[PDB]
Amino acid sequence: VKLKTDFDNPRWIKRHKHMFDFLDINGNGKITLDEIVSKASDDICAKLEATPEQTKRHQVCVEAFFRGCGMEYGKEIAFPQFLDGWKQLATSELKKWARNEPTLIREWGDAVFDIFDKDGSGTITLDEWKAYGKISGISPSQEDCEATFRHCDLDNAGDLDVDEMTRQHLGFWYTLDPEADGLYGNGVP
Ligand SMILES: O=C1N2C(=N[C@@]1(Cc1ccc(O)cc1)OO)C(Cc1ccccc1)=Nc1c2ccc2cc(O)ccc12
Ligand SMILES: [Ca+2]
C-alpha cells in the first residue's frame, strides 16, 4: 500500500475541499475546532448515548485529529490554511504508520466503533453505519451507506471491521489510493 504524499495533486485538494465545505455548514468559509467538537460530542456522542469515558475518549480523539491539521479552540480556519494543515497531518500520519505507531485516524476509529458494538468484536452493522452516516452527516443517504459496505472487505456476518476501515482511510484521506477511491461511493469525491 502506497506511502508517498501527493499534496500537489488536484484530486487530493478537491477531496478535502469537499469535506471542509461539509464542515463549513453555515457557508462562510471558516470553521473552528469549537464547532467540530460540538459536532462530535453534543451532536454525535450524545445522540448515540455513549458513556462519559466513551464520549471523553471520542472527543479526545477528535481534538487530536483536527489539531493535527492545525485547528485550535478559538481559531477561525479558512480553506487554504486547512489544506496546508492537512499536508502536515497526512505527513505525520504516514510517519506514525510506517513505525506501527497508532495513527490519529486509527484512534478515532477505535473510539467510534466502541460506541456501536460496545467493547468486543470492533465490527458494526449496516444499520449501525447508516445511523453514523446520518448522525455525522458524512453520508446521510441510506444508499451511499450500502456502497461503502460493498467496497470494503467485509466479514462473514455482513459487518465492517474497524481494521478494514482504518486501512481504507489511510488510502482514502492521506495517499490517494485507487482502491481507496470509491470508499464513500460518490458521496465524497
Ligand atoms: O473518518 C471519519 N471522518 C468523519 N467521521 C469519520 C469518523 C471515523 C469512522 C470510522 C473510522 O474507522 C475512523 C473515523 O467517519 O468517516 C468526519 C465527520 C466528523 C467531523 C467532525 C467531528 C465529528 C465527526 N470527518 C472527516 C473524517 C475523515 C477525514 C476528514 C477529512 C476532512 O478534511 C474533514 C473531515 C473528515
Ligand atoms: Ca463556517
Residue to mutate (ligand 1; options 173, 175, 183, 184; most atoms within 8 A of CB)? 173
Whether the CB-CB separation of 177 and 151 falls below 8 Å is answered with no
CA angle 111, 114, 119 (to 5 degrees): 135
Which amino acid belongs to residue 116?
Answer: F
Q: Distance of CA 86 to CAs 31, 90, 101, 179, Å?
A: 14, 6, 19, 21
Q: How many CA atoms lie within 13 A of 55 on its CB side?
A: 16
Experimental approach was X-ray
C-alpha atoms less than 13 angstroms from C-alpha of 188 in its C-beta half-sphere: 28
Residue type, 174: Y
Query: Taking a C-beta distance cutoff of 8 angstroms, is the pair 163, 155 a contact?
Result: no
The verdict on the CB of residue 109 being under 6 Å from ligand 1 is yes
Q: Where are the domains of the chain?
A: 1-189
Backbone conformation region of residue 76, classed left if phi is above 0, alpha if psi is from -120 to 50, else beta = beta
Closest residue to atom 15 of ligand 1, CA basis? 138
Work out whether the CA dihedral 37, 42, 48, 51 comes out positive or negative.
positive
Euclidean distance between CA atoms 14 and 24, whole angstroms: 15
Rounded distance, CA 93 to CA 6, Å? 14
| Residue 97 annotated as catalytic | no
- State which of 43, 129, 145, 169 you would mutate to test the pocket of ligand 1, scoring each by most atoms of that ligand within 8 A of its C-beta: 169
Q: Return the beta strands (E) in the chain as ranges.
A: 30-31, 77-78, 123-124, 160-161
DSSP-derived 3-state class of residue 95: helix
DSSP 47: T
Distance CA 14, CA 139 (A): 17
Among 177, 176, 180, 175, which Cα is nearest to 164's?
180
The single residue of 12, 97, 129, 132 carrying the catalytic annotation is 132
Helix, strand, coil % over all residues of the chain, rounded to 5? 60, 5, 35
**Are residues 133 and 168 in contact, defined by beta-carbon separation less than 8 angstroms?**
no
20 grid coordinates:
471542509
**Resolution (in Å) of the shown entry?**
1.8
Polymer length in residues for the chain: 189
* Cα torsion angle, 139, 16, 32, 54, sign: positive
174 lines ligand 1 (CB under 6 A): no
For ligand 1, atom 12, which residue shows the shortest CA distance?
Answer: 109
Regarding the beta carbon of 124 and ligand 1, being less than 6 Å apart is answered: no
Taking the centre of ligand 2 as the mean of its atom positions, its distance from the CA of residue 2, in whole angstroms, is: 33
Best CA proximity match to 96, nearest among 159, 22, 174 = 174
In the set 58, 97, 169, 173, the catalytic residue is: 169
Angle at 138 between CA 136 and CA 142, to 5 degrees: 95
Cβ contact 76:86 at 8 Å: no
Which residues lie closer than 8 Å to 151 by C-beta, 6 or more apart? 168, 182, 183, 185
Nearest to residue 188, comparing CAs of 43, 19, 37? 19
